[PDB]
Amino acid sequence: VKPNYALKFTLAGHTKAVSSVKFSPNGEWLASSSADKLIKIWGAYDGKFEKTISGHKLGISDVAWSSDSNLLVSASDDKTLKIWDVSSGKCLKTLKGHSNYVFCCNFNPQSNLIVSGSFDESVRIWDVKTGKCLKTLPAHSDPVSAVHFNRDGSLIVSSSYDGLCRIWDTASGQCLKTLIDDDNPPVSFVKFSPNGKYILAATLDNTLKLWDYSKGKCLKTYTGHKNEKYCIFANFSVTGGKWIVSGSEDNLVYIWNLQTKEIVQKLQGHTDVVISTACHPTENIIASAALENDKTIKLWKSDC
């Protein structure tokens, strides 16, 4: 079985490259971040522009939702993260401590903690309420491209241009595992699977890999796309068929069957690299976003 994603809406508004898109956990909203220093909020089902959230001094590389859909956190070249109250648009806290660009960010499932990764080669863990840094992990020897908590928040996975994925104990800060396959390309993205068993990792050799975390083994590889330069997000799509979804440097969105590793669809429409994709939590909807020559976000919907 193959899905049939079809283009429904195109969202224009950002004035520079879009850097990340994320659906709110409650399914109502899409948040986007951009090199234009802005966060924009859009209706998840109709693509209707809702509001702009402003405050960063330089471009934003990542934005992420709290699990109750009330807060956002953003990571900026201004070397800060900002915590936002979405309803009021207020910047609640500015998280200062990284010594270089902040590249990636996420809340833990409880949403009492934020994890961040930076060009300063560290991972920081921050208290959401106080906006204060709790731990700094000397995690990598090159910029940190992604950070993500597991299902219960007890672990953090990080990835780096240094070619490593590392798993950290949230509470103690200890490195529990280092994962790397037979070659050492920069690792450009990682995240835990929805069930927490696996880690999905992208490397800048045109490859996505599914790792069994507990066993430290690569189980599956997904290929066919182009990814040698950009830190492109990847997703697990779970509302219909079980897919892996990723942007590509040939301007397409790729969708693979998770189990069989076959490509099941390619989405054409963007005019530049698709840097970010997101999958809606309840409906078969994919959001995709593109770089500077395009500047748009697209919403695609399928019957499977």
Binding site: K16, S19, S34, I60, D77, F103, P143, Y230
Partner: peptide, 10 residues
């Protein structure tokens, strides 16, 4: 030059 680390690329 593109304005963010992620949109600039490796």
């Amino acid at each position: 030059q593109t304005g963010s680390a992620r949109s600039e690329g490796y």
